């Protein structure tokens, strides 16, 4: 007999955690609220009317009532207070404890269920991890960069800066969490406790629910006080208590079935590992590693909520997207005046630029229309963009340990507008295959072994 | 007997979803609150007074009361507690279950109705979709471009990029949801469940409501306890319960009528597919496709709220709108006149403009009446507009990897006012087929391989 809204304290989380609640958690929260309602109703029902009316049996045979002008009433010669005394005594002694304390057992079981549901949200060690993960997930879902990505079928420096900051935050969080294995373990334990709690409530309640009967029969051995051997009592609340007990059993059965579904869902597919196979297969972004424990599980929960969050979060775990972002913001801070002052006119009166150890080629490079020599040193995974057609005066290109991809327009421009090529390489992988389709080259300079085992000079057959 | 604020846990949803509640959902929510109110009232009424005053009948005929100095009272020789006992016994055994458990049945039915109404708001797999859809819908309704468009009959950078971002968010959301089918199916299932629940409730309640009588007659066979065979009872709460049951019947009838209207509205017109036919007539946007399942459904739902939402949202579904947005942002960021400073008189003493790698042709181009040479480089999906007829002095057009389409007026202008054409192409798709219908051409320049395997010079047969 304590209002639901004050018992609700046990069952309430942040609205932020709404993402972390799969459908089974939501269903069990609803069912727990209903269980709490019937616990409160039964408790008030008992407290305000716990009556038990008892009448003595004048003819008693074998500790049992013999059950045998106009009719006249039977006279027992008992005070109202003697009737009250025998009611209290037979309600205390010869009434089954289940019919007495059922609405309190219901409340206690419901509170244990609520505590099991919300423990991992209240426990600080996992509450911190969940709130950190949900904040990161919401920021990734909010970031404009995740909109630009996945859309491949010039950007602002400030947003392009906070996007790299989000990459760093994701990396730090992943490093900090991916070794924990505490959220998964705690969730395992909570579900197991819920299942073995349901599997006990069902047995004991079904076993004892037959003891809630309306017509109780008591023999309390108080002959000195009232003068009657045995009494025939009547527990008026018994029918409504059976109804509430049966309704509670139905609710507990549903709760246990849902918890068994959750337990089975966790016993299969090994939630400690996360695949990301679908995204890397439908976006060609294969560079998304399998996520280890305590981070695979938290992603599996969001998949139960919305696969969209996982998809929009995978973009912040791929190295390809990181490279794209670093190229994109390399262009943001690179103006053209900072590029102009950095340029050098060399000994042959040719304007040159020398770059080394960057993540790629800034696109702002190719607006420096006076440039005549381009040098690229130790830059990985380069692709030549079409804007190279703007460098009408280019004569030399130096590729030092830099493999380069290219498509046809830029290729044609280079076929028609190049005089020299320098290459410094370790092996064949740093030799672009397209060089032999060129036609205006006047100098070629190769630094490295041109031969392989049993394949002498295959590199230069063309 | 739980106050209706605790029950209001089941009966509420976040106001973000007023857009998704048609008038029938609003009416059923109101009716459900009223039914909950009468359930609570009946529950407290029963708990505080579930009395059944019973008096014995001294003259009994055919298991019924014969009902046949100054007047004096009838002496029954029963203690107060024997009266209590027979009240309890006749209330348990000889009072109809409907008259006892009517308010609890009302509470159970109302809870089931509320659950069936809010399930699709609580179910994460559809709750996520509805939240996503409504957020996109509100952003589209409030976005400045939605009123910049539809009015056709120096722009903020932030606004200009968020409009583009909103276009892509609409595209991604449409792709993610349009193959769903789940929201509509689950809504239909909820409505069907409500309709069968109404059909069952009205049946059983009408069939049994006649059993709530005031004067009950009980024969419970307790002579060993009271000495009286049959009793004439009286359920003081019977008339109030009858009027409460009739009020509940009225509410259930209204609820069922509304739910059958919803079922009918869902059954006809094939809500799995939208039209946009009305919108695309008053907008001159024939490029707005029919919308498939799970997206047509929420469009239909919003139309039940305000058709303006769907109208202001349909702009982000037409390719023409995206093209116009890109043209407008392009012309804004590359100002009308900055172009004049950008022009160049070339080596052949012809005034030229060189453009590259844009999304289309800025309309500001065709105010540059001094032009003689136009260069277009790597621009997709170009259609030449009629305003090219303004450029009376045009003598050269260079299309470098820029496919172009055209209609007859601009085409005739170019037929009559062109001397040379240069084309740089990857394959035939970048060759405009109309060139052979030209008449005033003096130079043709093709850059690219004109031949394919076993198909020499088919490209140039014309
Ligand atoms: C609404 C929130 C309810 C809050 C309850 C408040 C107090 C109620 C009674 C107290 C019981 C609560 C559980 C206490 C268990 C110890 C918690 C604690 O702080 O220890 C820290 C532990 C230690 O980490 P570990 O060594 O890596 O894991 C092995 C672990 N010893 C094991 O169980 O192997 O780190 C852990 O890993 C935690 C151990 C696992 C505990 C799992 C319990 C799940 C549900 C428990 C809720 C209580 C249910 C009944 C209470 C309801 C009462 C009406
Ligand atoms: C306030 C919200 C109340 C929340 C309920 C809390 C728990 C109360 C009792 C639980 C009953 C819930 C209804 C069943 C939902 C089960 C969800 C579940 O287990 O799997 C999720 C299912 C997956 O199925 P599917 O892939 O779409 O195809 C099969 C499909 N079901 C079919 O019929 O082929 O996805 C689905 O498709 C869902 C099935 C659609 C059925 C629509 C049910 C609407 C009314 C249900 C409300 C409960 C009413 C009674 C509760 C009141 C108790 C007082
Ligand atoms: C927290 C609040 C929620 C708490 C509770 C919600 C549930 C409320 C109880 C509703 C069931 C009433 C009932 O017991 O029906 C029985 C009567 O027989 C009895 O058991 C009652 C009479 C007692 C005398 C001995 C028998 C059987 O009657 P029926 O007509 O055969 O079937 C009833 C089902 N029907 C409605 C589908 C027809
Ligand atoms: C949750 C709270 C909401 C719960 C409930 C809201 C509804 C409240 C009940 C109002 C109706 C009272 C009533 O029963 O009227 C009848 C009296 O006759 C009776 O039935 C009562 C007397 C019982 C004795 C046997 C008859 C008929 O009286 P009338 O004057 O012929 O007509 C009444 C209608 N009028 C007001 C339009 C005139
Ligand atoms: C959820 C599905 C399975 C419906 C659940 C209904 C079952 C589990 C509940 C509802 C009513 C309950 C019964 C109500 C009363 C009695 C009579 C008693 O002498 C033995 C237990 C017994 C028989 C209960 C057993 C469990 C019961 C049958
Ligand atoms: C679906 C969920 C929410 C409710 C399930 C309905 C069940 C649990 C409810 C509704 C009808 C109820 C039963 C109707 C008939 C009786 C007769 C009564 O003398 C003993 C209890 C018993 C057996 C009730 C027990 C509880 C009961 C079975
Ligand atoms: C606003 C609407 C929905 C209220 C519903 C009005 C009707 C359904 C309610 C209001 C007044 C009620 C009636 C008042 C008169 C009587 C006579 C009484 O001896 C039996 C109940 C009965 C027959 C009631 C039945 C239900 C009743 C007719
Ligand atoms: C909103 C509209 C549908 C109101 C409809 C009113 C009708 C359908 C409802 C309202 C009150 C109801 C009546 C209330 C009182 C009685 C008297 C009882 O001995 C038999 C049932 C009976 C006859 C009910 C039958 C249905 C009833 C007449």
Short mmCIF file of N, CA and C in Angstrom, two decimals, chain A residues 160-223:
data_model
loop_
_atom_site.label_atom_id
_atom_site.label_comp_id
_atom_site.label_asym_id
_atom_site.label_seq_id
_atom_site.Cartn_x
_atom_site.Cartn_y
_atom_site.Cartn_z
N UNK A 160 34.82 20.51 -40.60
CA UNK A 160 35.84 19.54 -40.95
C UNK A 160 36.87 19.35 -39.87
N UNK A 161 36.94 20.28 -38.91
CA UNK A 161 37.84 20.10 -37.78
C UNK A 161 37.15 19.26 -36.71
N UNK A 162 35.91 19.60 -36.37
CA UNK A 162 35.23 18.84 -35.34
C UNK A 162 34.98 17.41 -35.79
N UNK A 163 34.88 17.18 -37.10
CA UNK A 163 34.76 15.81 -37.59
C UNK A 163 36.00 14.99 -37.29
N UNK A 164 37.19 15.56 -37.45
CA UNK A 164 38.41 14.85 -37.09
C UNK A 164 38.50 14.68 -35.58
N UNK A 165 38.04 15.68 -34.83
CA UNK A 165 37.97 15.54 -33.38
C UNK A 165 37.07 14.37 -33.00
N UNK A 166 35.98 14.16 -33.74
CA UNK A 166 35.10 13.04 -33.47
C UNK A 166 35.77 11.71 -33.80
N UNK A 167 36.57 11.66 -34.86
CA UNK A 167 37.39 10.48 -35.11
C UNK A 167 38.27 10.18 -33.92
N UNK A 168 38.93 11.20 -33.39
CA UNK A 168 39.82 10.96 -32.25
C UNK A 168 39.05 10.51 -31.02
N UNK A 169 37.89 11.12 -30.76
CA UNK A 169 37.08 10.72 -29.62
C UNK A 169 36.61 9.28 -29.77
N UNK A 170 36.20 8.90 -30.97
CA UNK A 170 35.78 7.52 -31.21
C UNK A 170 36.95 6.57 -30.98
N UNK A 171 38.14 6.93 -31.46
CA UNK A 171 39.29 6.06 -31.26
C UNK A 171 39.61 5.90 -29.79
N UNK A 172 39.59 6.99 -29.03
CA UNK A 172 39.88 6.90 -27.60
C UNK A 172 38.85 6.05 -26.89
N UNK A 173 37.57 6.28 -27.19
CA UNK A 173 36.51 5.51 -26.55
C UNK A 173 36.62 4.03 -26.89
N UNK A 174 36.89 3.72 -28.15
CA UNK A 174 37.04 2.34 -28.57
C UNK A 174 38.21 1.68 -27.87
N UNK A 175 39.33 2.39 -27.76
CA UNK A 175 40.48 1.84 -27.05
C UNK A 175 40.14 1.59 -25.58
N UNK A 176 39.39 2.51 -24.98
CA UNK A 176 39.10 2.40 -23.55
C UNK A 176 38.08 1.32 -23.24
N UNK A 177 37.16 1.02 -24.15
CA UNK A 177 36.01 0.18 -23.85
C UNK A 177 36.18 -1.23 -24.41
N UNK A 178 36.85 -1.38 -25.55
CA UNK A 178 36.86 -2.64 -26.28
C UNK A 178 37.53 -3.78 -25.52
N UNK A 179 38.12 -3.51 -24.36
CA UNK A 179 38.73 -4.58 -23.58
C UNK A 179 37.97 -4.88 -22.29
N UNK A 180 36.92 -4.14 -21.99
CA UNK A 180 36.26 -4.24 -20.70
C UNK A 180 35.53 -5.54 -20.44
N UNK A 181 34.56 -5.86 -21.30
CA UNK A 181 33.70 -7.03 -21.13
C UNK A 181 32.99 -7.03 -19.78
N UNK A 182 32.45 -5.88 -19.39
CA UNK A 182 31.71 -5.76 -18.14
C UNK A 182 30.23 -5.52 -18.39
N UNK A 183 29.89 -4.70 -19.39
CA UNK A 183 28.48 -4.49 -19.72
C UNK A 183 27.85 -5.79 -20.20
N UNK A 184 28.55 -6.52 -21.07
CA UNK A 184 28.02 -7.80 -21.52
C UNK A 184 27.88 -8.78 -20.37
N UNK A 185 28.89 -8.84 -19.50
CA UNK A 185 28.84 -9.78 -18.39
C UNK A 185 27.71 -9.43 -17.43
N UNK A 186 27.54 -8.15 -17.14
CA UNK A 186 26.48 -7.73 -16.23
C UNK A 186 25.11 -8.02 -16.83
N UNK A 187 24.94 -7.75 -18.13
CA UNK A 187 23.67 -8.04 -18.78
C UNK A 187 23.38 -9.53 -18.79
N UNK A 188 24.40 -10.35 -19.05
CA UNK A 188 24.25 -11.79 -18.92
C UNK A 188 23.72 -12.17 -17.55
N UNK A 189 24.37 -11.65 -16.50
CA UNK A 189 23.97 -12.03 -15.15
C UNK A 189 22.56 -11.56 -14.84
N UNK A 190 22.20 -10.36 -15.28
CA UNK A 190 20.85 -9.86 -15.03
C UNK A 190 19.81 -10.75 -15.68
N UNK A 191 20.03 -11.11 -16.94
CA UNK A 191 19.07 -11.96 -17.62
C UNK A 191 18.98 -13.33 -16.96
N UNK A 192 20.11 -13.88 -16.55
CA UNK A 192 20.10 -15.20 -15.92
C UNK A 192 19.34 -15.14 -14.60
N UNK A 193 19.57 -14.09 -13.81
CA UNK A 193 18.85 -13.95 -12.54
C UNK A 193 17.36 -13.81 -12.80
N UNK A 194 16.99 -13.02 -13.80
CA UNK A 194 15.58 -12.89 -14.14
C UNK A 194 14.95 -14.22 -14.53
N UNK A 195 15.65 -15.04 -15.30
CA UNK A 195 15.12 -16.33 -15.72
C UNK A 195 14.99 -17.29 -14.54
N UNK A 196 16.02 -17.41 -13.70
CA UNK A 196 15.92 -18.30 -12.55
C UNK A 196 15.02 -17.74 -11.46
N UNK A 197 14.62 -16.48 -11.57
CA UNK A 197 13.65 -15.91 -10.64
C UNK A 197 12.23 -16.25 -11.08
N UNK A 198 11.96 -16.09 -12.37
CA UNK A 198 10.70 -16.52 -12.95
C UNK A 198 10.48 -18.01 -12.79
N UNK A 199 11.53 -18.80 -13.03
CA UNK A 199 11.41 -20.24 -12.92
C UNK A 199 11.22 -20.71 -11.49
N UNK A 200 11.35 -19.83 -10.50
CA UNK A 200 11.05 -20.18 -9.11
C UNK A 200 9.69 -19.64 -8.69
N UNK A 201 9.40 -18.40 -9.09
CA UNK A 201 8.10 -17.81 -8.82
C UNK A 201 7.00 -18.70 -9.38
N UNK A 202 7.18 -19.16 -10.61
CA UNK A 202 6.15 -19.99 -11.22
C UNK A 202 5.90 -21.24 -10.40
N UNK A 203 6.96 -21.98 -10.06
CA UNK A 203 6.76 -23.23 -9.34
C UNK A 203 6.10 -23.00 -7.99
N UNK A 204 6.66 -22.11 -7.17
CA UNK A 204 6.11 -22.00 -5.82
C UNK A 204 4.71 -21.40 -5.84
N UNK A 205 4.45 -20.44 -6.73
CA UNK A 205 3.14 -19.82 -6.77
C UNK A 205 2.09 -20.79 -7.29
N UNK A 206 2.41 -21.56 -8.33
CA UNK A 206 1.45 -22.54 -8.84
C UNK A 206 1.20 -23.60 -7.78
N UNK A 207 2.24 -24.02 -7.06
CA UNK A 207 2.05 -25.03 -6.04
C UNK A 207 1.14 -24.54 -4.93
N UNK A 208 1.30 -23.29 -4.50
CA UNK A 208 0.59 -22.81 -3.33
C UNK A 208 -0.71 -22.08 -3.64
N UNK A 209 -1.01 -21.78 -4.90
CA UNK A 209 -2.20 -21.01 -5.21
C UNK A 209 -3.48 -21.78 -4.95
N UNK A 210 -3.41 -23.10 -4.85
CA UNK A 210 -4.61 -23.86 -4.51
C UNK A 210 -5.05 -23.63 -3.08
N UNK A 211 -4.22 -23.02 -2.25
CA UNK A 211 -4.52 -22.80 -0.85
C UNK A 211 -5.35 -21.55 -0.60
N UNK A 212 -5.62 -20.75 -1.63
CA UNK A 212 -6.48 -19.58 -1.48
C UNK A 212 -7.90 -20.06 -1.72
N UNK A 213 -8.59 -20.40 -0.65
CA UNK A 213 -9.97 -20.87 -0.72
C UNK A 213 -10.86 -19.99 0.13
N UNK A 214 -12.11 -19.85 -0.29
CA UNK A 214 -13.03 -18.98 0.42
C UNK A 214 -13.47 -19.59 1.74
N UNK A 215 -13.84 -20.87 1.73
CA UNK A 215 -14.37 -21.52 2.92
C UNK A 215 -13.24 -22.21 3.66
N UNK A 216 -12.63 -21.48 4.59
CA UNK A 216 -11.59 -22.03 5.44
C UNK A 216 -12.24 -22.75 6.61
N UNK A 217 -11.52 -23.71 7.20
CA UNK A 217 -12.04 -24.46 8.33
C UNK A 217 -10.95 -24.51 9.38
N UNK A 218 -11.19 -23.91 10.54
CA UNK A 218 -10.16 -23.77 11.56
C UNK A 218 -10.56 -24.49 12.84
N UNK A 219 -9.55 -25.02 13.53
CA UNK A 219 -9.71 -25.61 14.85
C UNK A 219 -8.53 -25.13 15.68
N UNK A 220 -8.74 -24.08 16.46
CA UNK A 220 -7.64 -23.33 17.06
C UNK A 220 -7.45 -23.63 18.53
N UNK A 221 -8.27 -24.49 19.12
CA UNK A 221 -8.14 -24.88 20.52
C UNK A 221 -8.16 -23.65 21.43
N UNK A 222 -9.28 -22.94 21.38
CA UNK A 222 -9.60 -21.96 22.41
C UNK A 222 -10.99 -22.27 22.92
N UNK A 223 -11.07 -23.13 23.92
CA UNK A 223 -12.33 -23.46 24.55
C UNK A 223 -12.56 -22.68 25.83
#
